[PDB]
Design a protein around this ligand. Structure first.
Ligand SMILES: O[C@@H]1[C@@H](O)[C@H](O[C@@H]2CO[C@H](O)[C@H](O)[C@H]2O)OC[C@H]1O
Length: 302
């Protein structure tokens, strides 16, 4: 654990939190638990709340991993961001095998309702729909879109709101890092349209999985995302190939500069445990020691 907490410091700057992705496998090993307890104030389940883990077989839910994280979070006063309710990846074959509109709709609604109800009132925000956009801005042709149609998004959000009116509902996606990129402009326009039709989209989550030097563009991208009018926006899965302090500080400043940005979540704790470990993209090294990027963030927030 680092002496200076980025969560404490960002809270002092007026934001809600600075957190990290984690799960039982991390909390039970190394110094992950201690680091999170001391330097972060929010956690997102890296995998335990996804569809393949929670509903491997239809109507047969498994909350072992999810319960571990939620309980640990509550016991340690950490906020929680539910991830991911509707997504084409890490999706059971029984779901993708469905071709009937009514069937898939009910299946999707039940999945959403079951997970959110179990943790009702305990989750600050949920990534209801994940990666629904193609790079050109068109909607990704997933089983949900192909079988239910474009209305699957409004349906997912309306269902989520009814399940837990306390949680902030997000649509999450990547490559929303540049203001001139098609995808960024498209999600803004679509979210503007959906909210206008009454869809309860409370926030846009920008994964922010960057490569070296892409932090600079976020300074203009985040404000653009905020222009969609959602009450909230957030950096949800931050990591940067190379872990340059320049990229990290730029992303933090982008959030500080955007009134509606509630916080930042970095996608993991130590480099070797990153899903992109070959790019040592996190804030702590294999020795669980703070990297130059962590200190740079601290210095920027003070
Ligand atoms: O442990 C990794 C996770 O980190 C990874 O997370 C996904 C990555 O793709 C998207 O960003 C999605 O929103 C995240 O949940 O998923 C694979 C798993 O092995």
């Amino acid at each position: 654990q680092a002496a200076q907490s980025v969560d404490q410091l960002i809270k002092a700057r007026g934001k809600v939190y600075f957190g990290v992705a984690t799960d039982q496998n991390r909390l039970t090993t190394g110094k992950n638990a201690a680091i999170i307890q001391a330097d972060f104030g929010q956690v997102t389940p890296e995998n335990s709340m996804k569809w393949d883990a929670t509903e491997p077989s239809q109507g047969n839910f498994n909350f072992a991993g999810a319960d571990y994280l939620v309980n640990w979070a509550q016991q340690n006063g950490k906020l929680i961001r539910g991830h991911t309710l509707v997504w084409h990846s890490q999706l059971p074959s029984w779901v993708s095998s469905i071709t009937d509109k009514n069937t898939l709709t009910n299946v999707m609604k039940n999945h959403i309702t079951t997970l959110m109800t179990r943790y009702k009132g305990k989750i600050r925000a949920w990534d209801v729909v994940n990666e629904a956009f193609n790079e050109d801005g068109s909607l990704r042709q997933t089983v949900f879109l192909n079988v239910i149609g474009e209305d699957y998004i409004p349906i997912a959000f309306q269902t989520a709101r009814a399940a837990d009116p306390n949680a902030k509902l997000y649509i999450n996606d990547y490559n929303l890092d540049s203001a001139s990129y098609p995808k960024t402009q498209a999600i803004v326009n679509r979210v503007k349209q959906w909210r206008a039709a009454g869809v309860p989209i409370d926030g846009i989550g920008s994964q922010t999985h960057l490569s070296a030097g892409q932090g600079a563009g976020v300074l203009q991208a985040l404000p653009l995302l905020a222009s969609a009018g959602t009450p909230e926006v957030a950096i949800t899965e931050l990591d940067v190939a190379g872990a340059s302090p320049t990229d990290y500080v730029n992303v933090v400043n982008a959030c500080l500069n955007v009134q509606s940005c509630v916080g930042i979540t970095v996608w993991g704790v130590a480099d070797p445990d990153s899903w992109r470990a070959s790019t040592t993209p996190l804030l702590f090294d294999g020795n669980f020691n703070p990297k130059p990027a962590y200190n740079a963030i601290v210095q920027d927030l003070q």
